[PDB]
């Protein structure tokens, strides 16, 4: 559903370098007598929360980024785009074929030969793009550079600034420590950053009923805090379904190209080759997929290392490549043709998301040789992708017990050269199906605290079945707090502000504000009556009005001078005064100011 | 509700030193062709899960411990027990007075003068009681001493044994590192241990409708894993309600004596004195309350230290003592009469649970001077209580960000001399009301991993309202996994066994077993059809049947000898063999054994 998020309001901040920009937020005003500024919150929901914008899925979200991508003059319009083929939708026809999105008036772009295109390429060129200033404003949460907040935490050697400037964003991208998944063909996108030195982001998974039901999956997820969304659709209508998704997505769209590639060859893993895969890549690039999960780490001699595992290979896309490597006994062609993949993704600025094909499916299989062999392989591929100018982030576990979480983070930073980490959890235990959104939340907060850039969410009933509309919301909210719990522990400038604002709300009995500042206001406002008086009782501690602290005198006397107690002190009589004033003021610990 | 827990069966193990004992568990049998022993699980649910025992709340659970407490010959029957007074139930009469429990045929015991009574006193005397062997059997999970499991984890210097012997239990109690909350007047109790070197325990809170509805709160909580239960009932009928609870409780019952004491004096905190409090103590001791939460740490000069807090004093019982200390300006009488309190609790073997009166209610107020001042005070009181022969455990936060969790654990171990830790969470963030069962689960697992003995649960909608019947179950399950996630990380002998059993269950497609081993089988079995064939597909990795590993030869050749690749290797031709056999066997990664 759409409409303004309960208890909040969509607000924007314009750009300085790029006055065209309108960075989105949602503010939550507090009670007038609280004397506090409104609380600014990160908002990936997009134009669906803005009551000033009418969204028609048959038309798609307005391409507010397109005007500035062309303005760079590095992109050109593809004279002959790639027409949709029968196998793109699983050879579906007639009434069984998904409704084609009217993408008639949408220009498809490709980089001009010789010209720079990717954010990484711009960054290393000393160029600050529109997207870089966009995420800079967004990361500061509309907070003044003149007024920071005293941060208190442990980021384990991270380089988190007090204020995110567009120049700072460029530098993080320049050294591959942060990425901005922004395909040139995704004009509907509201740019976001992914890095250890920024806010922790989360991902919500959707995929394939009516296409409107699939678009609603996208809207529902992003409404409640999902930063990026992946279309893990399989089977038929993969192409047409994803058309409606990307056109109506303000958040970065992720895919696993081997999914659709496998369907074009009728689920026969050995029928996969470079020919079909290259076609799938270009197909999704011209649609505007911001990042591909490519399992180019699953090398042939890594397969026997999984023979001793308890749950074996649990990655779908990773097991596909495994089955392929067993049928031909030729090296992973995503690895052998990795150079050519980079040349394609660079032309459209598609970010790399190196897959966790050999990730642990149980706590027993965690941190085994098979997992780390792939991990160190991704680090080598990261350098190869970096040298082609393609943005990179690494994917990780999985099912990991807490005492091994730190080990995973250490290996990643060393071997993947501080590239943004992307984790599915991890799940700290395997014994709680139906509550795996909580078992993974424990691990997600920990490794997010250790320095993970983005966290892929885990639905409650994940090892039980498909998630319903309420479990998706449960998953997003659960991972939004886990990301924030990590932000709070890392001492990110703008985390405690939210914590303290709602804490003072409870303290001053400002009920409406306490419910509006809640991570899930819809649930919190269920206990709110909008007709009741919006009160704001500002009080002060009784002892704060006590001058000389008589209680300190007496205790500092009975320890050093037990002889001075045989007489009415100036402290003892002073305490009798406070007892008098306390009871006279109504025997209240917190006396009201107003 | 009662009845056998879904997918499991109540099993017992007899005692060696005490053949009368019947230590309770619930086993979960796996598929016959899996060739695995049944999985033994900790079960605090009591006789309500045993279909061989008819439970009548009007009669109460059978006192199966009573026969062995009297057998020690240290206790005597109180000739004149304490009759229930009007103020015990808040001066309620007629139809507004709760139904009195028919406690006619229940002998009330008190320690004989000069004789030992508490488990600590027995332990330091070199005595192994019936309760000590009871918890030893229970902690081993019916596992053979001949067959341990290779444990892998980090307990931060804990002394966790491979096998819990009754002698080991005594030693932990002897040094105050573990306790067994076992009042002599709680014969219905199935003994349990609380310590860092044992399984992590959890607590569920109940309190005051029909008394049967309150007993159902107790049954519901313990059914799903609650180790101890506290009756935080307030207002009227506090006495009579708690009568039905303790008589029908196989788990240790906890209370906060200042709650009922405050009601006897009509909610006027300043009307509280030693006279009323001593009466309340003896009242609850003769009922069989296993441990009291006493806020004897809230000293008078600690109150002004809370003046700078964001949320101030959030502890109910702790704020009561604060208001009292402001009205008289005399030191906390629970602190000044602490010696006399110990003399009462020792006579009935009531364990100490030193309250967290000045615990943080927000992440901002975490680890402030007010909190730690009380904490170090409890450590001094712990020594005083220890020297009276009273079992002690310490209570902690609260609302703490992850980077401060370790600091809390370090202060506790040092100043409270490795006494069992009892924590309300902690909540890692303050921005997610309605999901505070998850925000606290992150902190509960972490500090439980660091070495917390017991974790007080936090209901989902805790900062929103009262928990319903489903939120209680949600809370218990959430904290049962958080406790296990901590057990798994600490590498407790018997944690990975559960994790691995359910992991092999998923791997061998043994669906029924996967659902039965789930922490919440009732939810997991919802996706289970009992009519479908109970299959058990045991398979093996294809590469495990590969002899010389041709994939290793080829990769170890192309790195050292690129010249040897211009010819069909014995490895290249051997890989063509495996490709052949792989496709001939059905192109399956995991070939079936049967
Ligand atoms: S003397 Fe009384 S009022 Fe003054 S600081 Fe101490 S407790 Fe507070
Ligand atoms: S040669 Fe083929 S079958 Fe043998 S170990 Fe390597 S991958 Fe497995």
Residue numbers in the entry:
A (entry chain A), B (entry chain A): 15 to 222, 227 to 612
Sentences from the paper on this structure:
ThiC, the enzyme discussed here, catalyses the complex rearrangement of aminoimidazole ribonucleotide (AIR) to 4-amino-5-hydroxymethyl-2-methylpyrimidine phosphate (HMP-P) in the thiamin biosynthetic pathways of bacteria and plants 17 and is an example of a non-canonical radical SAM enzyme. The CX2CX4C motif of ThiC varies from the canonical radical SAM motif and is located near the C terminus of the sequence. The homodimeric structure of Caulobacter crescentus ThiC (CcThiC) showed a (β/α)8-barrel fold and suggested that the cluster-binding domain, which was disordered, resides near the C terminus and inserts into the active site of an adjacent protomer through domain swapping. The cluster-binding domain inserts into the active site of an adjacent catalytic domain through domain swapping as previously predicted.
One structure of CcThiC and one structure of AtThiC stand apart and provide insight into conformational changes occurring in ThiC. In the holo CcThiC structure, the entire C-terminal cluster-binding domain and [4Fe-4S] cluster are clearly defined; however, the cluster-binding domain extends away from the active site and the cluster itself is ~25 Å from its active site location. (v) The positioning of the [4Fe-4S] cluster in the active site, along with two structures lacking SAH or L-Met and 5′-dAdo, suggests that the tethered ThiC cluster-binding domain moves into the ThiC active site to initiate catalysis and out of the active site to release products.
